Amino acid sequence: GLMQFTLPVRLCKEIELFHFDIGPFENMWPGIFVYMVHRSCGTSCFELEKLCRFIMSVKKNYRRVPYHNWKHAVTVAHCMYAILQNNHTLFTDLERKGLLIACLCHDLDHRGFSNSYLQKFDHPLAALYSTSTMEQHHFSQTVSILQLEGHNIFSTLSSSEYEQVLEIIRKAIIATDLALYFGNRKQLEEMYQTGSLNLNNQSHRDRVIGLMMTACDLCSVTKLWPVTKLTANDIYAEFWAEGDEMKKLGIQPIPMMDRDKKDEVPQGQLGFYNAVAIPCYTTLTQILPPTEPLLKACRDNLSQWEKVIRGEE
Numbered sequence: 645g646l647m648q649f650t651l652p653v654r655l656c657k658e659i660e661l662f663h664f665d666i667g668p669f670e671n672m673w674p675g676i677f678v679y680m681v682h683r684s685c686g687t688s689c690f691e692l693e694k695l696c697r698f699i700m701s702v703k704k705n706y707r708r709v710p711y712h713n714w715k716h717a718v719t720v721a722h723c724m725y726a727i728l729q730n731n732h733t734l735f736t737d738l739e740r741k742g743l744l745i746a747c748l749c750h751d752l753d754h755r756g757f758s759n760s761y762l763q764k765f766d767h768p769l770a771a772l773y774s775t776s777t778m779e780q781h782h783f784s785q786t787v788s789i790l791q792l793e794g795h796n797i798f799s800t801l802s803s804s805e806y807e808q809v810l811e812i813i814r815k816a817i818i819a820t821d822l823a824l825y826f827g828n829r830k831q832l833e834e835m836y837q838t839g840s841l842n843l844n845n846q847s848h849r850d851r852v853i854g855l856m857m858t859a860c861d862l863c864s865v866t867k868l869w870p871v872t873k874l875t876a877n878d879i880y881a882e883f884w885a886e887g888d889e890m891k892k893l894g895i896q897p898i899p900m901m902d903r904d905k906k907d908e909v910p911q912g913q914l915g916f917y918n919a920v921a922i923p924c925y926t927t928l929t930q931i932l933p934p935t936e937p938l939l940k941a942c943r944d945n946l947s948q949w950e951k952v953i954r955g956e957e
């Protein structure tokens with residue numbers, strides 16, 4: 645266990661920052677992830693033979709879609725790494741273990757379509773799981789990979805720590821269903837502003853971890869403007885594929901997903917930043933002050949989208 649992963653100096657420095665981009669080199673992404681586990685968790689949390697075999701099975705089971713791909717998986721895992729590192733003492737050894745794996749696995753086997761398109765398509769997954777359809781599939785896919793011979797990275801945990809970490813991971817993945825974020829955030833907003841929020845309460849921890857999951861999942865909006873903007877093309881590339889699929893079922897898609905209505909994109913971003921992103925990072929900063937840089941960067945990118953509408957860029 646005397647094998648440490650190191651990064652080049654620039655990555656070594658920039659990886660601690662929230663707005664870090666993992667770069668266009670796929671073959672460095674697993675090392676970035678292992679680097680993060682070792683510093684976040686310990687050089688001993690996992691067996692390196694098992695972890696690497698787990699990481700490469702997870703990579704295999706992400707598809708080649710414009711946005712919900714292996715790059716998303718590692719980007720979301722880096723955001724959770726930054727949160728965990730700026731909030732060292734607030735999380736148990738197990739939560740740090742669990743949440744980084746949850747992040748990496750949270751969009752396993754994503755096809756690039758919303759839960760809504762599965763229902764209207766009448767996809768078998770919609771019949772098997774009536775809500776959080778893809779999120780229940782992602783968790784299912786994670787358990788399958790953990791059960792491959794040589795892949796159980798949790799082996800050294802007790803029976804009880806094992807059940808705890810799969811429960812931390814299952815709640816974590818379900819919480820990336822953005823339909824559940826609105827209620828979750830409203831409740832956290834309420835508990836913080838009445839003073840009832842209590843991190844020794846497991847149901848309160850669960851909601852907080854869920855908000856973090858949303859924050860990590862939406863973290864494309866917290867990067868420097870050029871990363872945010874170019875990630876938005878990949879997001880809209882999936883949205884327009886889905887819109888096209890909606891029209892093939894004989895359903896006019898909402899305008900955000902209609903590729904005839906690209907002109908409305910900057911205004912669509914305003915709504916999303918105001919309705920989703922800003923609220924998410926406001927509440928997360930109120931509960932975990934050291935995550936303020938996510939709010940700051942999200943507000944900057946809001947300002948960047950406003951400048952696009954005014955026609956300045």
Ligand SMILES: CN(c1ncnc2nc[nH]c12)C1CCCCC1
Pocket residue numbers: 822861862864865876879913916
């Ligand atoms: C990432 N989410 C976004 N939706 C719309 N505009 C965005 N700009 C950055 N992120 C955006 C969605 C991604 C797919 C699941 C639903 C959330």
Ligand SMILES: [Mg+2]
Pocket residue numbers: 750751778820821
């Ligand atoms: Mg997802």
Ligand SMILES: [Zn+2]
Pocket residue numbers: 716720750751820861
């Ligand atoms: Zn995701």
